[PDB]
Structure formats: C-alpha cells, structure tokens
From a paper:
Enterobacter agglomerans strain Eh1087 generates the phenazine antibiotic D-alanyl griseoluteic acid to compete with other microorganisms in its habitat. EhpR belongs to the glyoxalase I/bleomycin resistance protein family, whose members have a wide variety of functions extending from simple binding of toxic small molecules to their chemical conversion through enzymatic activity. The EhpR monomer consists of two βαββ'β fold units (' indicating antiparallel orientation with respect to the other strands) that are typical for members of the glyoxalase I/bleomycin resistance protein family.
EhpR behaved as a homodimer during size exclusion chromatography and crystallized in space group P212121 with two and one dimers per asymmetric unit in the apo and GA-cocrystallized form, respectively. The structure was solved from single-wavelength anomalous diffraction data collected at the K-edge of seleno-L-methionine labeled protein crystallized in the apo form. These crystals diffracted to 2.15 Å and the structure was refined to a crystallographic R-factor of 20.5% with Rfree = 25.9%. Also noteworthy in the EhpR dimer are the extended N-termini, which give rise to an "arm exchange" between the two monomers. While the apo and complex structure are otherwise highly similar (average rmsd < 0.6 Å over the complete monomer), F109* undergoes a significant conformational and positional change on ligand binding. It adopts a different rotamer and moves together with the loop from E103 to G110, which leads to the formation of an open conformation of the ligand binding site with respect to the apo structure. This movement is required to unblock the binding site and suggests that ligand binding follows a multi-step mechanism. In addition, the finding that the binding site is blocked by F109 in the apo structure indicates that the ligand needs to induce structural rearrangements.
Numbering used by the authors:
A (entry chain B): 8 to 129
B (entry chain A): 7 to 128
Write the structure that this text describes.
Amino acid sequence: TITPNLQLVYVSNVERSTDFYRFIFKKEPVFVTPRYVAFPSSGDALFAIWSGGEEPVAEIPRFSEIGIMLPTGEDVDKLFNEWTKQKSHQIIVIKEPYTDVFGRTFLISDPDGHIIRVCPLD
Amino acid sequence: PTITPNLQLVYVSNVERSTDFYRFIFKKEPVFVTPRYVAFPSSGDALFAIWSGGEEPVAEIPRFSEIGIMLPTGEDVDKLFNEWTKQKSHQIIVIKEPYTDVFGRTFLISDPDGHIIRVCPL
C-alpha cells in the first residue's frame, strides 16, 4: 500500500516529552520503552518520540509541523483557552489563534522545539 | 473532541517536484491540490501535506524528525529498496542503505528538500 503512518520526532528527555504528549493528546502511550515511546494516531498510525536519533537544538530552524486537526474553528480557541489557562504544563505560544486559508489556527512549540499546529478539519 | 496528530506537514521549496515525488513514493494521487498546498491520504482520516508557504528548507541544516513508512515485514523493506534505487525516472537520495536498527530492518532516504524518510516493518 505505502503510507506515512509513523510520524517520528527526536526528543532529549523521553519522560518529559511522554508527559507532555500525554497531556496534549489526553491519551496514554500504547508503547513505552526507555528510549522510544509511541502514541496512537489515526488508524494503524503512530506518533513516536525517540532519543535514538540526534538531540534537538532550540536555535536550529524546523522545516515541518505536527498538525492537529479538530472538527471546527470553535474547538481550536476553546482548546487554546484550556491549554494556556492551566498552569501545570509549560505551553510555549508561537502564534496565538488567527485565521489562515483552512481557518482558525494556532501554533505552540513542544519541549524540544517541534512546532505543533492546531487547526480546523480541512 | 479527540486530539490526534493527524496532519504531518512538510515545508517544500517546489510544490510541483514534491507532488511528483510523493505521488511516486506513495503510489497514490493526492486528495487535495492547490499551487502552494498539496495533501496525500495517510492512515484513517489523517493527512500528509506539503506546503511552500513555510520557511524554505535547507539541504545541509540538520533535521530532528522523520517521515516514517511502516510496511508489514522486513522482507517488504528490502523489497521496496531494490525498486526505488533500481528505477531511473525519479532520483532517490539514499541516506542509509538497508540495515538493522531498533525498529528492525530499516532504511533512510531524503526527499528533494532533505526531509528524512524512513522505511521500517510493523
């Protein structure tokens, strides 16, 4: 068949990133080992964090995004409100909610500088 | 609303060449095409998108993520490699030839903007 069913990101601290994605996704990982953790994605697809590649560098620009498509533009803002209201987890804002071609969007950075974009279903 | 990472977005320099590249790699037409934004189906309702409106990628800047393709067995992985390097129409930049890593039988290639693509087995 041939599908991109594994989105894989390099992380420096597997514990801290596991805990961050657990909070972002509101889901447990389906696979945990000390250096490699996978969270469910859509269908038989996985989103994986791994310390076995190279350690991300904050000052190095990134050329991709972890996109999170929710049903509506309303789900996006009340997901930004809920994320930035809570104190317990560091949510670094890159762009507060605005309107792109697909609609209501925002951008946060994960602990290792991976860009996460939240947006409505295109 | 469930929060899934269902949009793997990559920045490309040339949407045309990238669309032709991904079309060949996936064996699949894209489902959404504009001049600056192209999406291919991934698993479930997830998408793999290429976008020229981001920061333009640079070949020699290191990358901290990978586009993973999980096939059923190690013997598909070796299979997929022979084909890709064998054919002449589409230039395929090998980063690592087939070897054993933590995923099993894997290999790595680069897309035309230096995005890293890994093929491995479920």
